[PDB]
Symmetry: C4
Subunit: 281 residues, 4 copies
Amino acid sequence: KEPCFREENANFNKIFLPTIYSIIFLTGIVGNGLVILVMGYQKKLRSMTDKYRLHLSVADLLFVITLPFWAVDAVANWYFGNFLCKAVHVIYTVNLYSSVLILAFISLDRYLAIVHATNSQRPRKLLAEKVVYVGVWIPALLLTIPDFIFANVSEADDRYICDRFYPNDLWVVVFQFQHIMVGLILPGIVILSCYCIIISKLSHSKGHQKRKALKTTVILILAFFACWLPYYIGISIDSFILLEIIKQGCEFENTVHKWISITEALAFFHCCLNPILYAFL
Amino acid sequence: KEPCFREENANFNKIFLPTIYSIIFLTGIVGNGLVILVMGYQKKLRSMTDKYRLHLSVADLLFVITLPFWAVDAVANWYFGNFLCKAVHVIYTVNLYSSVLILAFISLDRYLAIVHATNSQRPRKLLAEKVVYVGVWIPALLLTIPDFIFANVSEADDRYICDRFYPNDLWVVVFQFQHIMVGLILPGIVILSCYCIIISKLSHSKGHQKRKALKTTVILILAFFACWLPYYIGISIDSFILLEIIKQGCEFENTVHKWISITEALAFFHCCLNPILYAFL
Amino acid sequence: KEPCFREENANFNKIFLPTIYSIIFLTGIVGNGLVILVMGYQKKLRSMTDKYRLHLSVADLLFVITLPFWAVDAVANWYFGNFLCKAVHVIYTVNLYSSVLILAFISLDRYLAIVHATNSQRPRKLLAEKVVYVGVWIPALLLTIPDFIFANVSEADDRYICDRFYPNDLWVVVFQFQHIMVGLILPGIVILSCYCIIISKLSHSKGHQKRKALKTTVILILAFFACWLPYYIGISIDSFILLEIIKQGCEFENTVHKWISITEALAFFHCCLNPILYAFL
Amino acid sequence: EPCFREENANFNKIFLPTIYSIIFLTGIVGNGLVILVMGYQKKLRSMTDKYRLHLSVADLLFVITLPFWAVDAVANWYFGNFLCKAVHVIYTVNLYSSVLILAFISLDRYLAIVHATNSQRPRKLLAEKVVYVGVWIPALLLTIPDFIFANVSEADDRYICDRFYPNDLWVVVFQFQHIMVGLILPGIVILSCYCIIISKLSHSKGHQKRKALKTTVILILAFFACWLPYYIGISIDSFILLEIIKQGCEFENTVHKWISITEALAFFHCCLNPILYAFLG
């Protein structure tokens, strides 16, 4: 009843995923380094949204440093050993959770700036300079413990596959549900609640279109979640497959893994769209 | 004579269709809930088109409530129940016909507002206030009766198929003709007669501002019919296959069924494009 | 001798060509009927290029009237008979040659309007009122004689194929080379010469006022030839196969035929891009 | 041992000639119009326009030989050894000259914004005398292997024209030279120039962040986006030929197909200079 025990990634992933990773690596390096140079070295962070997009650019730069390891592990497989596999996985997790927590924080900042426009200028300073660290980076760093523990390289079938290796499959299901939860649902629920209240409080602000700093952050968050949504659907289906709820054939269990691979490579475009909304607005 | 076998949905579709359904679910919930909040709960409807577009938002929200059942059915056939299968099909039919009848009513509103801009302020108000129910929702609720009668969960082996199971194949053909007719042809003929007589009374006149509120109607209706056209082509081809008129083999029938599934999933994006035009125009 | 077995349409190209033909049929009827209504019957043509574009709309309407027969012949085969096969092929050829000759006349009209800006107002009117018929419709109605001679319905097997049935394959080659010539090369050379001289006499002045008006015709001609270029590549390669010059495989003359089918369906969008440019003025 | 790569598929024998013909038409028309307008009607206003004139000359030179690529894609090289050498030489000249011209564009912009005061002699020196020795002399010096190793190999029935080296280590070293002096070194120079420009244009108060460094950024980004999939493919192939990427023999065929299509798609760089003169973006 074992399935196909994964299939050798289609020969085309292995030229496509390397290509996607390299495009995202180039765009991420150039764009996020330019954002850090302009908005975080020369200190022209004008709004408090540009404070959080600096945090996004730092997280995305950290991830795109390790993206060439993803490309190499796509073409060939892992050569870099165990410590660097752990480093790549914890950096991937830090980016994963920090970016979406930062987006939730930008939604909170927009909610405080629009809805509580009279009295929330002092909470908007603490939330962006002292509370952002303990609400984004500390939760993002505390969720790399499963990757400090389980992210080892398995010397296998002349493969050496760098992945999170768990004692059993229930751990995989639990941690994929945890990823889905604290990376899509709760930050997504917070963002949706903040923006629904913003739209309800802005719908009668005389009509005066306060859709300025709102449109940029709406585009940023919508593009981020559009990049990540197919991957989250794939891993939710995969987690329900592992939980013996989707008892279909092993070929479905392999096509969902292929879906996860391409949609995860395509979800790394979130590291590129923060600088893109500085090229455009 | 060769009763064919519906080959089970390509493993791909079993992850594509949930992905499309989930994208439409998120976009439709957020957009239509925000339209009902803004246009329907806060009374920011500024024209007669916005009342009909509020009706579209209500119908689309009703459908995207049941869309998660569609995604689960795309993965795991049916473990919700016969009553919930009936409710899902009834809501699907209500959306199907109410949305296109609302679009036809929008075309009548534009016809009366442009061709009869001097004596049509009461029949437009009377239309959008009282006749919209009798001409949109009563047809949508009295023509969903075949879902109350026929839509049931056949437990074919382990595949609990939730679909309309008519007594005869001719019933399937005649109801697909009914759907094609009162979902593409008659409302489509009405919408083109109302917009060809406007194009002809907007040139013989040379008008403007109204010209422009006519763009957000033309784009809405064109996008709806562009979403639904591949599905209607597919189901008309399926109906002519099922009358033993086409007879291109079982492989062609399987291809048509896959086309119908994919392009029906893609045609549900009409539930997203009503609030998208409130986000662009 | 190996006769090179001509496989039947794929099962997707039945259900795709029919979809492409239906989209183009709907768009062509609606748009070209509106153009003939407004810029034709209502005499709202005011630019001396709208006359030629009215001619395009007449040709495109004539073709999209016969497009449903193309969709039926895509799904089923020709049940309409020899005379109506001849009529459909004649209308196809008339559209084929008249549309490209009208675009050549548009380019020549812009050449006379820009290069000969002072003298050519009476030659332009003569060209658009009297010379246009004998230079577009008469050549298009004289190149359709081989359709009156050879287009026939062949009852081979159960497939009533409606196509131009020649004595030899050398006839196919010569009537594909004359198609390539009169449809891409000679009108294309005329259009390229006219627009190169236009640019050399716009860019040798502060031409900015008339570097629009020109933009619409440039977009129209470029979109037409972009639609028709893959088809012309396919049929040129097929003509060289039929000359036994390419002589590659038997799977390459079924790849070059499923290409010709797909790209000929996709080239019929030229009947839709003349009214679409009136939406994007 | 060798995978044994012998197939150009069948789509890539009709797709690639189609892509080559589209690029041949667009490149011939656009680059001829640029050379006529800029290099003959001296409408070179800027110093980007002189380098873009150099790009148009190089791209015109390559699209002259593009029909030979179209014939070699569907037929094989029946033109001769001298024509194989000439086409490969012109291909190499375009390859290196275009990217070195873009490096010169980046350096000219660097001198324009950063050293805005004391750079009008260096920017007139580079564009008038140093551009030849830094673009065309290097591009004609790295085409020496196209004079030495490019030969039509009769081999089997198909006379294949390619640059044939003694060992497979020469293929690797020349592919590495290609990657270096076509992507890395000019790309590093361009990135350094534009990063310093951004660090200087930002500080500048109200320095339109974009000015005319929009059109050059778009041109260089589009060029490198066109060439990046090809460079990923040939780097993967180069490490394959070093016996580093041992992932089978179907992977080498997949990589070679990737190289063929992504090399044809990389020739759209030969028409980005005129299309950015048709958009003025």
